[PDB]
Amino acid sequence: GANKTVVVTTILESPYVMMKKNHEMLEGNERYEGYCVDLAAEIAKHCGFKYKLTIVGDGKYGARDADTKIWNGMVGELVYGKADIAIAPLTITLVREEVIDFSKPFMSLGISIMIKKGTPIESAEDLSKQTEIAYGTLDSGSTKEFFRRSKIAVFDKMWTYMRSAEPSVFVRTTAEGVARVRKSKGKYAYLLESTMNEYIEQRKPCDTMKVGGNLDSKGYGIATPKGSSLGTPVNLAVLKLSEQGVLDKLKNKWWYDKGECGA
Amino acid sequence: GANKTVVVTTILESPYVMMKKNHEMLEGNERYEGYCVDLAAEIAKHCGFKYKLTIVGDGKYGARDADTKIWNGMVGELVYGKADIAIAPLTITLVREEVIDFSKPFMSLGISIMIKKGTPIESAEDLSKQTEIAYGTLDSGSTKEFFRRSKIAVFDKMWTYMRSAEPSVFVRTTAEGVARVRKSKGKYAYLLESTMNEYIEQRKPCDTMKVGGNLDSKGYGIATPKGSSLGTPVNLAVLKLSEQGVLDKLKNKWWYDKGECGA
Ligand SMILES: CNCc1cn(CC(=O)Nc2sc3c(c2C(N)=O)CCCC3)nc1C(C)(C)C
Numbered sequence: 001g002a003n004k005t006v007v008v009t010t011i012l013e014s015p016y017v018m019m020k021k022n023h024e025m026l027e028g029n030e031r032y033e034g035y036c037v038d039l040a041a042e043i044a045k046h047c048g049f050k051y052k053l054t055i056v057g058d059g060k061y062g063a064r065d066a067d068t069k070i071w072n073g074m075v076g077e078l079v080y081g082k083a084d085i086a087i088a089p090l091t092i093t094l095v096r097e098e099v100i101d102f103s104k105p106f107m108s109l110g111i112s113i114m115i116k117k118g119t120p121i122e123s124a125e126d127l128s129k130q131t132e133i134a135y136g137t138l139d140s141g142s143t144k145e146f147f148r149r150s151k152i153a154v155f156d157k158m159w160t161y162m163r164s165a166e167p168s169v170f171v172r173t174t175a176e177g178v179a180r181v182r183k184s185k186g187k188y189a190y191l192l193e194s195t196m197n198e199y200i201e202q203r204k205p206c207d208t209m210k211v212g213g214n215l216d217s218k219g220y221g222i223a224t225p226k227g228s229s230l231g232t233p234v235n236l237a238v239l240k241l242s243e244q245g246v247l248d249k250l251k252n253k254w255w256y257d258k259g260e261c262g263a
Numbered sequence: 264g265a266n267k268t269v270v271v272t273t274i275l276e277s278p279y280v281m282m283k284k285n286h287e288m289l290e291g292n293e294r295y296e297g298y299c300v301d302l303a304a305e306i307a308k309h310c311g312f313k314y315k316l317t318i319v320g321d322g323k324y325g326a327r328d329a330d331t332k333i334w335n336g337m338v339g340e341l342v343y344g345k346a347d348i349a350i351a352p353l354t355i356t357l358v359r360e361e362v363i364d365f366s367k368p369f370m371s372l373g374i375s376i377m378i379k380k381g382t383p384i385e386s387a388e389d390l391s392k393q394t395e396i397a398y399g400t401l402d403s404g405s406t407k408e409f410f411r412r413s414k415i416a417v418f419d420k421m422w423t424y425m426r427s428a429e430p431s432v433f434v435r436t437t438a439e440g441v442a443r444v445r446k447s448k449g450k451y452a453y454l455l456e457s458t459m460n461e462y463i464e465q466r467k468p469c470d471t472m473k474v475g476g477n478l479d480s481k482g483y484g485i486a487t488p489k490g491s492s493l494g495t496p497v498n499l500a501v502l503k504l505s506e507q508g509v510l511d512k513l514k515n516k517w518w519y520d521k522g523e524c525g526a
């Protein structure tokens with residue numbers, strides 16, 4: 001048919017999408033700011049569509065329930081037709097690519113370790129060979145599934161520990177994992193994507209550090225329901241924006257320029 | 264129809280595809296070794312097809328002639344139906360994605376600078392602000408087009424210089440650019456992908472260095488003619504291989520383990 005306003009699902013995750021301080025004062029897309037807010041505006045412009053930003057109702061990225069086979073989070077909003085496109089730090093994975101379309105990656109990341117400054121941990125091997133320091137991941141995301149499915153010795157060891165640790169080492173939101181690192185006096189480390197890790201390291205109170213090399217290499221993609229007319233134009237828009245340096249300029253805007261911890 | 268033997272186009276580029284020393288002794292796919300030789304075997308296995316490796320006749324990655332609009336290189340072999348799939352370090356670009364399908368990236372890279380050890384150059388800005396040291400790129404590839412199309416000040420400055428430099432700063436093969444760095448006594452720097460740069464840095468005679476940060480961020484994809492039945496299965500195979508750690512194991516095999524310059 002004729003073009004219609006596109007419903008964009010996204011997720012509150014710094015610095016991708018954040019509530020503006022005065023959001024009560026504001027309406028519509030103007031309530032929100034961040035990398036993916038800016039990316040949404042660029043994509044919509046290059047694909048020539050009108051759009052409405054919506055925050056995913058359940059606050060989740062997307063996992064499938066092993067019993068019901070029902071998808072939750074932003075993936076679920078696409079699968080069940082509640083949203084036309086997901087523009088968020090949504091990790092490209094085999095399980096997801098089978099049910100939704102992803103653009104080529106607009107940003108790269110790998111799973112990484114966050115510690116409170118001074119924590120005697122430099123790697124995933126270090127974490128796996130000790131018990132004083134608890135560690136965990138976000139629920140309903142690609143990091144948890146990485147550990148759950150890993151056949152690699154150190155990560156399988158980590159997963160075995162994390163799955164039955166008490167109290168639970170899993171958190172509902174990134175902010176919750178960060179708070180736990182900050183408040184646990186060096187006794188909790190948080191496994192999260194390098195992009196988020198790197199952003200938080202440069203924010204007050206400047207008390208966290210990324211340590212060790214990334215555990216994997218992957219990327220975020222713009223996701224559309226399978227067969228959507230938006231898939232192709234969105235993919236070309238990502239490649240165009242990449243080649244024009246726009247994605248690099250947005251990364252600088254929302255990471256380096258937001259840095260509060262000095263140089 | 265019924266499954267047929269797949270014609271794979273590729274390119275002699277270390278460590279992706281290399282002639283085995285005793286290749287005269289050998290036949291078929293056994294003539295060749297390297298990352299993309301191993302990747303081809305994995306993909307073919309996961310997609311359940313038989314295949315024949317073929318080296319691109321003109322030794323080029325792929326560019327389109329501005330007059331004739333004819334594609335050369337591996338892209339051209341796909342476009343004109345001479346090959347069914349390209350499994351090589353073929354950079355995902357807007358101009359190419361429009362005429363061929365790319366899988367999700369199997370490896371990431373950015374454009375980078377190679378110098379002879381001791382060359383007084385630490386960045387692209389440095390190169391652009393001096394004339395003693397010549398510098399250039401490979402012909403018929405994504406690095407040259409990056410500079411030619413760049414609206415970014417330092418790279419546009421570099422391109423203006425490179426396009427009319429005499430003698431020519433462009434080379435036909437990576438080996439030729441490397442030889443020029445090695446033989447020019449610090450007076451030639453070579454702009455090439457970080458992956459190739461990093462491999463060469465660890466090979467005898469151990470006389471080159473990668474300097475500065477990457478100029479861009481992108482990746483290599485497996486390419487198929489537009490609409491090919493191989494596209495979807497090949498893409499899922501890349502994601503599966505990624506998540507299984509196979510791509511990381513192959514990177515270690517062909518870079519770290521091949522290192523000849525010590526630790
Ligand atoms: C096995 N490979 C794992 C890998 C790595 N990444 C990040 C990445 O490769 N970066 C790329 S490739 C690319 C772009 C970017 C980017 N800007 O982040 C921009 C447009 C041109 C093509 N993503 C992946 C997948 C296979 C999980 C999707």
Ligand SMILES: N[C@@H](CCC(=O)O)C(=O)O
Nearest residue numbers: 061089090091141142143
């Ligand atoms: N980007 C991840 C969420 C963050 C994480 O799992 O660490 C996903 O798409 O599931």
Ligand SMILES: N[C@@H](CCC(=O)O)C(=O)O
Nearest residue numbers: 324352353354404405406
């Ligand atoms: N990977 C590049 C070739 C190497 C280069 O241009 O530096 C391409 O696909 O064109």
